């Protein structure tokens, strides 16, 4: 909302300056996004009266004879140029705010144009450039510099949160400032009404839509341009003056957050009917747009005999037909309170957002209607010389707000302050609240204009912001937390150590959007996403990722195209969605691998990644093994499942070639597991202090047999005194059985209480050879030194 300093200053006369004002509103809960100085008007621009307007034969232009002190002539093509109005004359030699082409006297279509009459846009007061500014013909003595009656203005751009609809009215803002201590000046609606009947009737057919509806009657109207003070005010607020009547309705709207519309009686017929539209019912709005109504739209209709016609979109925009023009003599003033939901729906339905819908949506003072009628009628009488009826047509009877219990003691308790009771009550009264009782728990009933005051807490917020949030002291709480809050942070701590360990091991963390490209379910050979967005940022982000590796692969590609990393070891922990939301950990290895930068030999690929993983789980103190299992997105040759503490938690392997090729990538290795990882409680094992037994042996095995299967058989039969079992060599060829391979095993035995007798050793090495060959494997070497 735009806040013209001097306009607000009309209600709050003591305002120190726009800067202090901004300060004051921040404390009240209103942030100003920006502050502008707006009506710089050069000296060369003076007020002029149009004595006569002559059309230039054969052109669409007019020669205007102006009285601007001396008589001057000017040429204009503006459709509204006509005699009987005041204008903004830019004498030759003037510098207009935005045309840089110093205004000069020039010859146009046969006549010497001594300067030019201005439009809102040319003067720099508004964006409208389709016509001239229209001032009252007698606004000023001809020739007087417009500056003198149109001083510059400072406008604040204020954020007005949804909870303060009363702040969508400058008077509402002023009342808040009043609470701070500033004197408040409310406009007096001086009215000279007449007791006569209203030449029309009111029928509220849908009360649900119009809970409170009133109609004022003003006649003998002399429609004309508004006074300079009012045009300057509206322009400063971002609106464009139209004329007397319309301008007043907009002025008051901005003043007290009360949209109101004037309907030319010529079109009302027998009366105003507030009702829903009939399906298809048409209505051409003021914006000049022909629209089709929905049976849900609430409308301000008129009727004549048996015909009923729409005059405007209730609470949103007035009908194009009923606008007040210069030949208008009498109007029906609509001042009501509409059902916020209905307005909301309708505004959405036709893609409209007006100063009116905006306010009716946020809410309007359920009892401000009649007071607003007086203000608008009062002004119509003063500016359009309107004669006003004493009565109003009124429908609906809103109940006043209820009392709210308020304990000054609870206010100080909830805030941690110690404001004296008296100050609290004095403040609530300044905001218009009625305060009853002697305490300690008072009866506070808020002003109907504050829709946001219903609970005692609301009331304490009032005391705090008026007192000022900076007056609230600083403190730290002390308490023993309730029992079930203990150890609640283990999960979080667990995942965090994981990341750190990973970053410590050598992995580089990466964050990737949770979104997924529905097409990648195909490219990466994954089941399609279970969750999709009804409103995606784009189709490439229309789903929620089911895996983490696809994303990491794409960042690899992207990184490769931007910079040319020779390698990469990445990891990412994040949420994945499928059946249930779960946390994953994925990693990626790519490039030449590890070794001497200058040398040639290198460790890399599959066994490098598995190398880091083994280190990871050792550092985490967890059992870890990889068994061969087929995975659609993995290379059939290099693909396995990951077992942590004997349970399947994910996979490890190389990216399927076909996929790498479709993405133009060299080979890539990766893995993805589900978190949280298995838990294994520390079971300290006092290590034996006696010498261990060493024995080597090889196992000839058919090439297809997986190392893990052998390893397992050896360990099983190895006995209960097996300390260590390591693989130090793998070979296949001569003198081995074609299609066979041997596995060099380093074994160790140890007894906790004493040294082991060779009986015990060899005996076990045997039990091993037994189940070993009993399985189908040969024992190449035995008892090897």
């Amino acid at each position: 909302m735009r806040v013209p300093f001097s306009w607000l200053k009309a209600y709050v006369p003591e305002l120190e300056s726009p800067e202090v004002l901004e300060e004051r509103l921040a404390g009240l809960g209103f942030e100003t996004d920006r502050i502008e100085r707006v009506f710089p008007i050069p000296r060369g621009v003076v007020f002029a009266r149009v004595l006569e307007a002559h059309p230039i034969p054969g052109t669409r232009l007019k020669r205007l004879v102006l009285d601007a002190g001396r008589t001057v002539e000017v040429v204009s093509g503006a459709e509204n140029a006509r005699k009987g109005i005041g204008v903004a004359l830019a004498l030759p030699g003037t510098e207009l705010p935005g045309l840089g082409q110093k205004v000069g006297e020039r010859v146009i279509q046969g006549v010497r144009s001594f300067g030019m009459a201005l439009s809102p846009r040319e003067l720099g007061v508004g964006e409208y450039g389709g016509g001239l500014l229209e001032f009252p013909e007698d606004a000023l003595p001809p020739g007087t510099p417009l500056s003198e009656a149109w001083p510059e203005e400072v406008v604040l751009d204020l954020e007005v949160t949804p909870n303060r609809p009363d702040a969508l009215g400058l008077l509402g803002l002023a009342r808040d400032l009043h609470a701070l201590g500033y004197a408040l000046v409310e406009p007096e609606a001086a009215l000279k009404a007449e007791a006569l009947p209203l030449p029309f009737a009111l029928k509220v057919e849908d009360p649900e839509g119009a809970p409170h509806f009133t109609l004022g009657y003003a006649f003998g109207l002399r429609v004309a341009p508004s006074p300079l003070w009012m045009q300057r005010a509206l322009f400063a607020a971002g609106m464009r003056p139209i004329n007397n009547v319309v301008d007043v309705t907009n002025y008051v709207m901005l003043e007290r957050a009360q949209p109101m519309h004037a309907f030319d009686l010529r079109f009302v017929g027998e009366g105003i009917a507030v009702r829903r539209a009939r399906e298809g019912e048409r209505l051409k709005t003021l914006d000049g747009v022909e629209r089709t109504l929905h049976p849900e739209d609430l409308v301000i209709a008129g009727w004549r005999g048996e015909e009923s016609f729409p005059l405007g979109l209730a609470g949103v925009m007035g009908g194009a037909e009923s606008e007040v023009r210069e030949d208008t003599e009498a109007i029906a003033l609509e001042v009501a309170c509409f059902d916020p939901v209905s307005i909301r729906k309708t505004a959405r339905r036709h893609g409209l957002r007006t100063e009116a819908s905006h306010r009716f949506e946020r809410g309007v003072d359920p009892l401000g209607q009649v007071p607003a009628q007086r203000r608008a009628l009062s002004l119509l009488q003063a500016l359009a010389g309107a004669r006003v009826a004493e009565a109003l047509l009124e429908a609906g009877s809103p109940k006043p707000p209820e009392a709210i219990p308020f304990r000054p003691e609870y206010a100080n308790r909830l805030l941690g302050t110690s404001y004296p009771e008296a100050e609290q009550i004095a403040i609530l009264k300044r905001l218009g609240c009625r305060v009853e009782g002697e305490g300690p728990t008072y009866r506070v009933t808020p002003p109907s204009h504050r829709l946001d005051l219903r609970l005692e807490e609301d009331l304490v917020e009032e005391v705090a912001r008026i007192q000022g949030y900076e007056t609230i002291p600083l403190a730290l709480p002390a308490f023993f937390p309730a029992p079930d809050n203990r150890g609640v942070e283990a999960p979080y701590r667990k995942e965090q150590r994981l990341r750190e360990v990973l970053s410590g091991l050598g992995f580089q963390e990466v964050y990737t959007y949770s979104f997924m490209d529905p097409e990648d379910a195909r490219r990466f050979r994954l089941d399609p996403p279970r969750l999709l967005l009804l409103n995606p940022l784009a189709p490439e982000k229309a789903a929620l990722r089911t895996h983490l590796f696809p994303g990491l692969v794409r960042v690899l590609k992207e990184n490769l195209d931007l910079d040319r990393p020779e390698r990469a070891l990445l990891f990412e922990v994040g949420r994945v969605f499928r059946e249930r939301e779960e946390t994953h950990l994925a990693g990626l290895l790519f490039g030449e691998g590890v070794g001497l930068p200058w040398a040639k030999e290198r460790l890399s690929g599959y066994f490098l990644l598995k190398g880091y993983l083994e280190a990871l789980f050792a550092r985490l103190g967890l059992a870890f093994r990889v068994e061969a299992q087929a995975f659609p997105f993995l290379h059939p040759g290099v693909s396995g499942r990951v077992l942590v503490e004997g349970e399947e938690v994910g996979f490890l392997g190389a990216l399927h070639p076909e996929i790498a090729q479709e993405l133009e990538l060299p080979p890539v290795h990766l893995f993805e597991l589900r978190l949280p990882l298995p838990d294994k409680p520390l079971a300290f094992q006092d290590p034996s202090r006696h010498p261990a037994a060493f024995r080597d042996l090889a196992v000839v095995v058919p090439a297809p047999t997986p190392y893990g299967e052998v390893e397992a058989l050896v360990r099983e039969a190895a006995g209960p005194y097996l300390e260590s079992l390591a693989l130090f060599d793998l070979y296949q060829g001569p003198p081995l059985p074609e299609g066979h391979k041997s596995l060099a095993f380093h074994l160790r035995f140890r007894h906790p209480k004493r040294t082991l007798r060779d009986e015990e050793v060899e005996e076990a090495v045997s039990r091993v050879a037994e189940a070993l060959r009993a399985r189908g494997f040969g024992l190449r070497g035995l008892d090897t030194p």
Binding site: F480, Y606, K610, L622, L682, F684, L727
Partner: protein, 266 residues
């Protein structure tokens, strides 16, 4: 094709010493109560380790500690403010001196916790070492009371052994506090009290020694109108019952087979 079950490249996997692990958990626990961790020097002056803490020479109090005295010139021992402090050099018999060092260098209110290596010339058994670790705690400020000291230890216990845990304080003597106390925490899983350490309300003379030293250094007094509590507990003792270690002598044994068993423990 590849045998994916095969052993991967033998990258090394590290780990942290159990004392480090236990120290970290203790520091984490007290950090949640607003304590900040700071360390002091192992080689300390007799002034900080004893005199400042109200333990004068040739009196029963001194005879309670088994001190390692040092010798050698050219050794520079800096004070709380980098000054050159004098006096007979020794290995600190406890972390308590850091209680005086911190106070001369800072102003209340505050909450510190100071882990540290301490030394005592005594026989080493399964629960006694000549070289072990302690964790001092010190909270100084206006209105600090013994109830706060009890509250602190209560939190330690809850955090260390769960909601069914509890603390027990009994009077004991320390020239540096008054009231003085020794405390134990109830270990629910093991069904028995563990004597963790000593504590109490910082002694009036300690605060006096601090400001007196501050004056020599040209600082204004800072502990005239404040009170405070402090405690000192055995890290190894807590680690043992916490990680199930049977002999305190393992800690400094350097045996990889022993150490590697805590690779998992955080």
């Amino acid at each position: 094709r590849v045998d994916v079950s095969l052993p991967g490249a033998s990258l090394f996997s590290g780990g942290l010493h159990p004392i480090t692990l236990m120290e970290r958990e203790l520091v984490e626990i007290f950090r949640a109560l607003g304590y900040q961790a700071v360390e002091g020097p192992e080689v300390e002056s007799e002034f900080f380790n004893f005199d400042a803490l109200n333990i004068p020479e040739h009196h029963p109090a001194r005879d309670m500690w088994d001190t390692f005295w040092l010798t050698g010139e050219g050794f520079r021992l800096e004070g709380p403010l980098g000054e050159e402090v004098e006096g007979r050099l020794l290995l600190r018999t406890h972390t308590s001196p850091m209680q005086v060092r911190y106070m001369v260098a800072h102003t209340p209110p505050f909450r510190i916790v100071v882990p540290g290596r301490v030394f005592r010339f005594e026989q080493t058994d399964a629960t006694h070492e000549a070289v072990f670790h302690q964790l001092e705690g010190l909270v100084v400020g206006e209105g600090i009371a013994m109830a706060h000291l009890k509250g602190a230890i209560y939190e330690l216990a809850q955090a260390l052994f769960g909601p069914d845990s509890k603390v027990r304080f009994q009077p004991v003597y320390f020239p540096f506090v008054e009231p003085g106390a020794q405390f134990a925490v109830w270990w629910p899983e093991g069904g028995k009290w563990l004597e963790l350490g000593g504590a109490g309300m910082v002694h009036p003379k300690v605060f006096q020694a601090v400001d007196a030293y501050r004056e020599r250094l040209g600082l204004p007094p800072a502990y005239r109108g404040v009170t405070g509590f402090a405690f000192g507990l055995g890290v190894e003792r807590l680690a043992m019952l916490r990680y199930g270690i049977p002999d305190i002598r393992y800690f400094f044994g350097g045996r990889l087979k022993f150490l590697e068993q805590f690779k998992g423990v955080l």
